[PDB]
């Protein structure tokens with residue numbers, strides 16, 4: 240079991256760590272059918288998605304997907320610094336797999 | 343996959359972007375039968391709803407509809423600036439499909 | 446579809462609006478059996494309830510009832526001004542059908 | 549329907565009101581199997597639990613038990629003043645039936 | 652029924668108490684498949700997980716696992732002092748069973 244985001248991220252193919260150390264600049268969420276997703280940006284232009292739940296997801300991921308959107312909204316509203324994101328780099332925008340918050 | 347609200351909104355019919363760049367002026371929520379909904383207004387008079395779930399919605403939207411009402415409530419209470427809303431313009435008041443927040 | 450709480454309230458018999466323009470003074474919550482409910486009071490003012498779900502609540506209302514209790518709690522804690530309540534006024538304390546928040 | 553915690557508490561057997569008029573001193577929660585519970589304390593030594601869901605609960609009470617733990621956590625974190633607790637006094641620690649909050 | 656985290660922790664095998672008396676230094680969470688977990692750290696290097704839900708958990712522990720991740724996230728954001736953790740010491744990082752917050 241990994242003990243940090245960077246080691247977690249290394250367990251997966253097509254992932255990488257983005258180091259932001261910054262608050263979220265914008266938070267966008269949609270309820271439109273087939274686009275039940277969130278999108279975040281940082282002021283450097285970095286853009287990330289929480290993907291719409293789908294066949295690339297297993298059942299254990301559904302609750303975690305909803306939690307991640309919860310986390311992004313509250314981080315946004317509190318202006319919490321995001322340390323790192325583990326993202327899938329084979330999607331545009333890159334898709335979030337994990338987040339770390341630290342000063 | 344869209345990277346912002348404007349591109350997402352353009353994937354649907356009968357939708358438009360309203361640019362508010364303002365906090366929500368009032369938040370109304372109802373539990374009354376057949377009107378289980380939320381209504382928001384802005385100081386310019388713009389009024390929007392999250393629709394009562396109905397025949398126009400699918401199962402994959404159910405959680406997202408509940409999430410949007412959560413997001414509007416906490417945006418209202420915290421005075422969070424709403425950047426844009428994507429809305430269906432064939433409902434009165436216009437019905438929210440997506441929101442973006444940015445300072 | 447109504448665009449404000451007053452018009453919504455006018456769609457139902459046995460309701461009225463109370464105009465409060467004040468924060469909630471006290472919040473009471475019970476998990477005791479058959480009293481799973483929330484009660485709010487306004488300073489030097491009235492008490493209101495969210496009814497226990499039962500016979501006279503249809504099924505889409507169950508989530509809305511839970512949401513309303515969540516709304517009253519967060520309003521109380523954040524000290525947000527309640528603008529108006531739409532209530533059923535056939536018993537004391539009057540039962541909440543809808544809430545509006547505005548400054 | 550009772551309009552305050554004291555009158556609510558009087559509808560049950562083996563309950564009583566403790567008056568605190570104080571913030572929560574400590575908050576404890578557990579996910580250990582068969583001990584999925586919460587405990588709170590006050591600086592006068594008063595200690596209360598939210599019981600593990602069990603045979604003594606009817607099914608409407610499950611959501612309410614979860615709500616109470618939500619309430620106690622955010623009360624603790626925000627240092628919200630707890631006015632009174634209605635508790636079952638046939639358990640150690642006394643088990644929470646209801647709470648009232650007032651500043 | 653225990654009245655505190657230490658006595659709760661002593662009801663189980665392979666558990667121990669870590670006394671921190673400090674805020675959380677970092678909070679990490681993941682939606683990646685088979686690693687739907689949270690990780691927290693403290694400035695002294697202590698690292699703890701909320702385990703991926705699995706065969707070692709009963710249904711009552713499921714909601715409690717989700718609650719604990721909620722608790723850790725808001726504790727982190729609010730700089731809440733964590734008093735103690737009860738953890739399983741047969742997992743690496745040690746796996747949280749219970750938390751207490753005080754002071």
Ligand SMILES: CC(=O)N[C@@H]1[C@@H](O[C@@H]2O[C@@H](C)[C@@H](O)[C@@H](O)[C@@H]2O)[C@H](O[C@@H]2O[C@H](CO)[C@H](O)[C@H](O[C@H]3O[C@H](CO)[C@H](O)[C@H](O)[C@H]3NC(C)=O)[C@H]2O[C@@H]2O[C@@H](C)[C@@H](O)[C@@H](O)[C@@H]2O)[C@@H](CO)O[C@@H]1O
Pocket residue numbers: 255256257258283284285286287330331332333334345
């Ligand atoms: C809306 C938009 O188009 N914005 C882009 C940025 O891309 C968006 O955000 C990124 C994170 C992805 O989600 C994109 O899909 C999304 O459109 C764009 O950022 C660069 O995007 C690249 C996409 O492949 C890549 O992620 C890149 O970073 C990696 O590659 C660069 C070299 O180009 C460096 O080697 C980086 O170190 C490397 N990072 C990692 C973790 O491997 C992104 O660029 C990096 O992030 C930017 C936010 C910015 O800080 C860059 O200096 C940095 O290199 C940027 C590119 O400038 O433009 C638009 O803002």
Ligand SMILES: CC(=O)N[C@@H]1[C@@H](O[C@@H]2O[C@@H](C)[C@@H](O)[C@@H](O)[C@@H]2O)[C@H](O[C@@H]2O[C@H](CO)[C@H](O)[C@H](O[C@H]3O[C@H](CO)[C@H](O)[C@H](O)[C@H]3NC(C)=O)[C@H]2O[C@@H]2O[C@@H](C)[C@@H](O)[C@@H](O)[C@@H]2O)[C@@H](CO)O[C@@H]1O
Pocket residue numbers: 358359360361386387388389390433434435436437448
């Ligand atoms: C409670 C009430 O009746 N309030 C009205 C506004 O209508 C409400 O809010 C709007 C946003 C919709 O949700 C309505 O269903 C709702 O009742 C009303 O706003 C205008 O509403 C029009 C629909 O009836 C329409 O949406 C219009 O915007 C479009 O058309 C205008 C012409 O008026 C312009 O061409 C706009 O560019 C165009 N916008 C887009 C994105 O397509 C709304 O008017 C605009 O928004 C207003 C809030 C205000 O800023 C206007 O200056 C602006 O044009 C307003 C209209 O005055 O009156 C009450 O406030």
Ligand SMILES: CC(=O)N[C@@H]1[C@@H](O[C@@H]2O[C@@H](C)[C@@H](O)[C@@H](O)[C@@H]2O)[C@H](O[C@@H]2O[C@H](CO)[C@H](O)[C@H](O[C@H]3O[C@H](CO)[C@H](O)[C@H](O)[C@H]3NC(C)=O)[C@H]2O[C@@H]2O[C@@H](C)[C@@H](O)[C@@H](O)[C@@H]2O)[C@@H](CO)O[C@@H]1O
Pocket residue numbers: 564565566567592593594595596639640641642643654
């Ligand atoms: C961890 C621990 O053991 N703490 C105890 C206190 O007990 C804990 O908290 C109480 C509220 C219960 O939930 C217990 O289950 C729990 O372990 C203990 O408080 C007294 O607890 C009694 C029950 O064991 C009882 O509730 C008592 O108050 C009642 O009785 C007294 C005299 O015995 C008076 O009649 C009170 O009016 C009566 N209260 C009511 C509402 O009927 C508790 O003591 C009262 O509250 C204490 C917090 C404190 O302010 C006392 O001065 C006050 O009498 C205390 C006190 O013995 O010891 C440990 O802190």
Ligand SMILES: CC(=O)N[C@@H]1[C@@H](O[C@@H]2O[C@@H](C)[C@@H](O)[C@@H](O)[C@@H]2O)[C@H](O[C@@H]2O[C@H](CO)[C@H](O)[C@H](O[C@H]3O[C@H](CO)[C@H](O)[C@H](O)[C@H]3NC(C)=O)[C@H]2O[C@@H]2O[C@@H](C)[C@@H](O)[C@@H](O)[C@@H]2O)[C@@H](CO)O[C@@H]1O
Pocket residue numbers: 242667668669670695696697698699742743744745746
């Ligand atoms: C990322 C990393 O490698 N970090 C390690 C610490 O381990 C992490 O945190 C601990 C709490 C566990 O969850 C690990 O699984 C996790 O990787 C590491 O902490 C020590 O970890 C040991 C188990 O691997 C063990 O728990 C130890 O505590 C016990 O043994 C020590 C002496 O080594 C003392 O006797 C303690 O009293 C005893 N504790 C109990 C409750 O029985 C951990 O060390 C303790 O906690 C540290 C955070 C630090 O304050 C030490 O002074 C203290 O002894 C530390 C060890 O330095 O290194 C990395 O930070």
Ligand SMILES: OC[C@H]1O[C@@H](O)[C@H](O)[C@@H](O)[C@H]1O
Pocket residue numbers: 271272356393398399400430431432433437
């Ligand atoms: O998914 C919700 C949407 O469904 C469409 O059919 C309708 O025209 C929109 O106004 C909106 O209700």
Ligand SMILES: OC[C@H]1O[C@@H](O)[C@H](O)[C@@H](O)[C@H]1O
Pocket residue numbers: 477478562599604605606636638639643
């Ligand atoms: O509903 C929960 C309650 O159930 C009662 O029967 C019991 O006597 C109380 O102590 C409390 O457990």
Ligand SMILES: OC[C@H]1O[C@@H](O)[C@H](O)[C@@H](O)[C@H]1O
Pocket residue numbers: 580581665702707708712739741742746
């Ligand atoms: O309930 C969860 C616990 O299950 C036990 O069997 C195991 O020893 C612990 O590591 C922990 O996973």
Ligand code: NA
Pocket residue numbers: 454455456457458459460461
């Ligand atoms: Na009416």
